[model samples]
Target: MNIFEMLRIDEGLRLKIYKDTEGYYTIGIGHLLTKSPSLNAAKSELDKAIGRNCNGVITKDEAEKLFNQDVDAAVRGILRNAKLKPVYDSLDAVRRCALINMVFQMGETGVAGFTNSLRMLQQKRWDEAAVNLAKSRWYNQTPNRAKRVITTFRTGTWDAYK
Candidate 1:
């Protein structure tokens, strides 16, 4: 189970913080429903994590196959669209690492907000890259959430790259 299910706390539903299409206070589990509106939103967010909206979601086997295809497509696009080789520069590594993580969770638009940060990386500005990442509107909106990612990024505690 994801953290929300494991914690047995659908904080998103507390006080109806995240209303559904029906516009009712949801005491329902936030992460439990595979078909609930919030879960659907999370799935979309997960799509963003992967850098694109998923047209069709399937079982793990299918997801693996699709993931391979999509990642190949995405990396190629990253190279072609950026008009550069996949050179492993320092700032590039940092932004790429973060983007990969975000894409894994939220998809392209999920990490697209890092537009400015990406530019800073292209310009080889590490300090500004880190700062831009830390000081985003989404970061402001979700401080704790942003902090966790930033912490993972700044520290090598996790398998940040590869």
Candidate 2:
């Protein structure tokens, strides 16, 4: 499966707005619409995207469209990071999806803070990269997901999906 498919499973398909684990107003495959700059802006964007008011329901097409947009934004965020771009470029598809997934969940700024891990990934030191990632609060917060990501990074395989 591709990054989009993987993320759809990991994030889950939510047609209605709900509070995420961190309590943000999220919807439609983990789209954080609460204060995406401002609550008004978020509501307006949602309304515009779905062609209706933010009445708690999102159509499948609208959700898919938003998901695509969010994924693209995540990719662009990863590429924009000077330290991350080369590392991202050097990876194969599975490893690339791991990075994209991390960036999707944590934001590019959050992932960019992994200076040492990114360096290890850049050097192709997969084990070291995984170890470094495991030591972070991100790992503690989401051990199951983090382990899958670490395994994907270390093995360069789709074992995470299995």
Candidate 3:
């Protein structure tokens, strides 16, 4: 529902490189396969694609741009979840944003794992919902960010992790 929360979810507390769904390397939210040899489709698919340049260190500005693009894409994908739309619209702003954040981090299919959390939210069980989030691998991998989101879920204020 909120743009900033989705930004945090996609970019996380800080910038880092991770793999995306297509088995290609990605850095910045959805900046995929920057330098991956496979990314060089026309060429390094065996050599390199279209004599394309491979990614290396990028500036903060570059990431900011990519993140915006990725966020747009994520939003489009998230809005397509019809069954989940009303549920999303029904929640408080923070909670709604959190769900969208989860959708950004893991797609709709992946967010299916948060069924209990979402149910708790639907039932207005804020504390229980936060607990469910804390119990996830999302928490394990993104402790600082997870805490920030849980804090927002509990209190409804923006709390960006340092």
Best by the lDDT measure:
2
Question: In model 1, which regions exceed 4 Å deviation?
Answer: 1-57, 83-95, 103-115, 140-162
Best by TM-score: 2
Compared with the true structure, all predictions reach lDDT values of 0.44, 0.86, 0.62
| Cα lDDT over the full model 2 | 0.86
Alpha-carbon runs more than 4 Å astray in model 3: 5-24, 29-62, 160-162
- Between candidates 1 and 3, which one is better according to TM-score? 3
Q: Is candidate 2 or candidate 3 better by TM-score?
A: 2
Listed in order, each prediction's TM-score against the native is 0.43, 0.90, 0.68
Worst 10-residue stretch by lDDT in candidate 2? Answer: 35-44
Q: What is candidate 2's CA lDDT for residue 88?
A: 97
In what order do the candidates fall by TM-score, top score first? Answer: 2, 3, 1
1-162 per-residue lDDT for model 2 (tens digits): 899888887889889877677767778998887745455566666687677786777888888989999999999988888977998999988999999999999998898899999999999998888889999999998898889889999999987888
The superposed Cα distance between candidate 3 and the true structure at residue 65, in angstroms, equals 3.4
Clashes (backbone N, CA, C under 3 Å), per candidate, total: 11, 0, 6
Superior by lDDT: candidate 1 or candidate 3:
3
